[model samples]
Target: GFSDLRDKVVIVTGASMGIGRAIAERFVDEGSKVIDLSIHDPGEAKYDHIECDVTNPDQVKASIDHIFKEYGSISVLVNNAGIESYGKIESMSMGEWRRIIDVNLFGYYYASKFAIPYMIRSRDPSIVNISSVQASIITKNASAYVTSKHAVIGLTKSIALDYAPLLRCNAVCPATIDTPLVRKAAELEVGSDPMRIEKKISEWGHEHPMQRIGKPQEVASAVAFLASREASFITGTCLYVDGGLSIRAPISTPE
Candidate 1:
């Protein structure tokens, strides 16, 4: 019954690329009205695109307001826009941490705050927040990124509990997803050979228990499930889209 996802209005942040784009595409495929809010356009898009900075609450509010004015309801809010920071706690600047928190954490809050009103008009509204495996695990450095991700989980729970049957809020924690972000990370050296980048990416994929990194559509499918009526009873949950990365510590060896 949930397969007919038409007539639903969806707002996806950071839809210009990567996982965000995948989520938006999936919703569009389901016949929903997908509105993409990102800082820049990807030049070519199959959905309605609105350039916005998630760090600015006013931008978020205005964007959501415009959406409601046009569509009257938001069936799903996908907080997928985020920034990454890589540095040890001691070395990271205050500005760096604030930027990460503002983008990764506050961005989600801003969107949810504005979208909730419109979402309330829908029958089965949901907020699917894209977090990370780092939310409950650890990696080298990346304190700001990890901390912001952790906060996202807390925010998801707060929304789910506070809104109750009126709204469903949950998180998707992914690990080593192959996307533009990962490509950037894979390129350890500027102007490095393409083989070097692929090698790095392959190394990361092999680290997962599944022996392969995840794809954007894989995460997108999880988001679709949570947003649909199929997950009516699910809330306050953090679904890990990680490829068994969160199940074992990296230090564990063959046993």
Candidate 2:
């Protein structure tokens, strides 16, 4: 058993890469048994993985019910599955909006609805959602992604209210993480040229209070803390990894 996570059962969704992958690894490193629930395999032989399509209620129900039957009860649920949208809202396709909402908000909802009762059995239980800075900040060309993330925060609080004594629920709002998906999205906004977008995003990084973009590992650590006993008393909160992006966004740098 891990000193921090010994004897805990954790389920993580959309953990094939990026911030989700980091959290999955951190959970294992902390001595917890993790079930990575994603479509893609981890490509490593050691970790436990269950293929999960979170938008499907029956599939999600079956996955959680089966995990409980096999591994006892799960103590933690990490709703890390999400997709981004980058287009003008007026011209945005209905499919685009639905796709983002289906995966981000609906997927989180599915996991919680199925996993909470089982988690209530644990002595201490936690739920963490990976939200975004856009949850609070309005950004151009990302209405669908932002709206879904905002709803994730709302969902986190609503669950926390109901599951108080038996459970804790919270969210981590990340800025622009240096993940491949993020890099692609950044390119779309700044342009398709990697070098140019990177340079621009780098400059934009300075606009934040920390003067740099956040890393996936940094956000994962926050997730780990929230799920661990250390954060036992904390719930229904949003831990922002934006490096002051919200506070500093509209303020221009003085020359």
Candidate 3:
């Protein structure tokens, strides 16, 4: 009934900024107690900060253990920490490829290893792992990132299936949202031509039926919904939040 987000013990990884930061802020706004897992903790109000490298099982266990020790339980988990290893697949370094999977795939595993039991203890437990439109779409210079995101779907669905009676797991696949990371990628593709950059960037928006890049807040709304009772019937699924980009073909087909 209602959002019922009030005072829910929530854990958000990669919570320093971008979508993670936005989710933390929205959780706090909805009265959820938030513990941020970030390498660079901003020490912001309403968020208790902790250093965690989600790829390492030990650190992930320790950080969440500390949270449970203090707060008693974690009702919601947001696996939002992820990295991009851009460049053509052949040009991608071993380090970049491994780093993308380590953070995006292994990290989710790490968090769930520890948090799943904690979630089981709560009557209304849920998880949201940040995925990308690449989970279904494709592009150049994003081989590693795209694969990792697709893996996120498998990870999320399995967990939802395993913990069905006690917990729910879901993912959000966002399109080219207007974030610093996208801006940086756009600069690489289109150089410093503000118009060219804008054009190349706008190309992502126009590529979709909806003529715009999505906002982090738009993604957050999906996360908030999934984590709340409002999404009681949803689980073991990936919701495409990509402005219809996943369905529209490049030039309307074979893209």
Candidate 4:
């Protein structure tokens, strides 16, 4: 069991909902002192919430400083705050690309930049970046999103290498999880019709090899393991919480 996580100071970004929320709640379940850094309040009150826009370095630095002052250590930092966008490279506006990169890529940078000092001093410090399956695979009309996720893997590896023996860093790439973000994407496909949106989401799940999308808790479980002493020897790698989606080929013939 991950009992070693008990009383550990953990920070989770964008934990107001979706996979981030699940990650925060899981740490709480493990008896870690969970702190959420997000723009909106998740309203759970089970852990501390710091209103932070991850893209802003000043805010991120201030939040990390506050956490360090309060707890004196940061055992785990999960960079999970991100936004989604859909458009082809040629059609996408500069603003759209910048927003996605700022939130998905630079947000991770700001948090890790400010948190690493305290994290290096804590026992069993770990940083987990919530990258996407798109980091490796490409989906049409999602150039910017895919590009940012790809860069996250590079960032993860760099941190893992630079902070070895002091701190551990890794990335988690999840695919087609049943979250509000996924549902919103489905809505875009089906024009806000509830039934059609549900159907569209189902279709997306069916496309995966497991024939079903993943749950937020499933991804959380992987994240928890990576951040725990159980994964002491693991670092600078990506864990796929994709339900077999990443391993499948595009062609399904004679099956």
For all predicted structures, in order, the TM-scores are 0.95, 0.93, 0.93, 0.98
Q: For candidate 4, which ten residues in a row score worst on lDDT?
A: 246-255
RMSD of each: 1.6, 2.0, 2.5, 1.0
How would you encode candidate 2's per-residue C-alpha lDDT over 1-255 as one tens digit per residue?
236677689999998888889889888888788898888888883458989898998999999999999999899999998887678877889998889899999999999999998999988889999998888887788888889988999999999999896899999999877787877867776888878888877886887788888888999889998988889899999999899898764655779
Give the least accurate 10-residue stretch of model 3, judged by summed lDDT.
246-255
Show model 1 residue runs off by greater than 4 Å.
Answer: 1-4, 189-191, 251-255
Q: Which 10-residue span in candidate 1 carries the lowest summed lDDT?
A: 185-194
- Score residue 236 of candidate 4 by CA lDDT: 98
Question: Over the stretch 99-175, how does candidate 1's per-residue lDDT look in tens digits?
Answer: 99999999999999999988888887999999999888778878888889999999999999999899999999999
Writing each residue's lDDT as its tens digit, candidate 4 over 80-147 gives: 99998888778899998889999999999999999999998888799999998888777898887899
Model 3, span 194-249: residue lDDT tens = 89988988887887789988888888889999999998889998888888888885
What lDDT would candidate 4 get against the real structure? 0.93
What lDDT is obtained when candidate 2 is compared to the true structure? Answer: 0.87
Give the better candidate number (2 or 4) by TM-score: 4
| C-alpha lDDT (0 to 100) for residue 152 of candidate 4 | 97
TM-score of predicted structure 3 = 0.93
